[PDB]
Design a protein. Sequence first.
Length: 341
Amino acid sequence: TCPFYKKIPGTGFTVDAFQYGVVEGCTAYFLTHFHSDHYAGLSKHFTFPVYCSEITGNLLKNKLHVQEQYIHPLPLDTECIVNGVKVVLLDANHCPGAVMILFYLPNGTVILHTGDFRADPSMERSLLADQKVHMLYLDTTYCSPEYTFPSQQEVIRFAINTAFEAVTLNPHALVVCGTYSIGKEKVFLAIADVLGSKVGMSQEKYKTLQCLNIPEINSLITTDMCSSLVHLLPMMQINFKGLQSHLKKCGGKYNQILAFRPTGWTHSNKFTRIADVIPQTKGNISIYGIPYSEHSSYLEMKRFVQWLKPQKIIPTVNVGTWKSRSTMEKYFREWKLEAGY
Ligand code: NI
């Protein structure tokens, strides 16, 4: 049975609600982005209308084989009518194709569902600027002050400089980057660009990347591992054993691996600056964990909400425990009292 925080009152609509069977009353199923916790339940046998971005629609069709007749892609930043209700899709600054959804209810209520997002001041000048929001369904993944991390730009700067240094010292080193889903493509694309290489990967991952409308992508990725000095591997293989095993397969072309694990937040963030990050090393293998996040830090979240000034907040993440729920509600009240809404 579908939880309340995935239902949109006054509509026949649900959000990211595909694992509950046929939802009683639902005339349209929205999908914010192509991550498995959110699409869980979709397959080629799904026969209800799915509304989403163009990029999400490319992945539904090519990776999950959803039939075309049930995929309804919408443009961003454009007022659209769905089953007689005005909606707008906005860029969520999450993974490729990720959106937030603005719903304009027949009774006059305006609701924003953020999906998964990394709040940014640029959002303060989208179509959000133009009217009031009554209810906010909020990605609260990192809703606690201990959650700090750097900008995406600082993290990429660290990775490019690290990789360029190592390979210039040793032209026989291989760089490997971990992946398990879409998102965080900048990590491997920025490193390959500084090294003048394409990124090599499996046929399944190449397929996924070809659905994402990235400009000039055919110039940047390949399935020919032998031609590439940046390789992508599943995140589970980014350990000393998995990497040793990969180095064996490269036929003596390389004698060193430098690997990156883009994580979300990790507690080494409470002490260390990005500049000071060091790898784990065993022999000719080094592994860097880098805090590249596609969710709001606590401060970015706070700033967005204090700017929007919603009448009610409904968290969508960390809702399973009473202590989490109580923690989040305390911060929401602080934010409201500090800003005066
Ligand atoms: Ni996500």
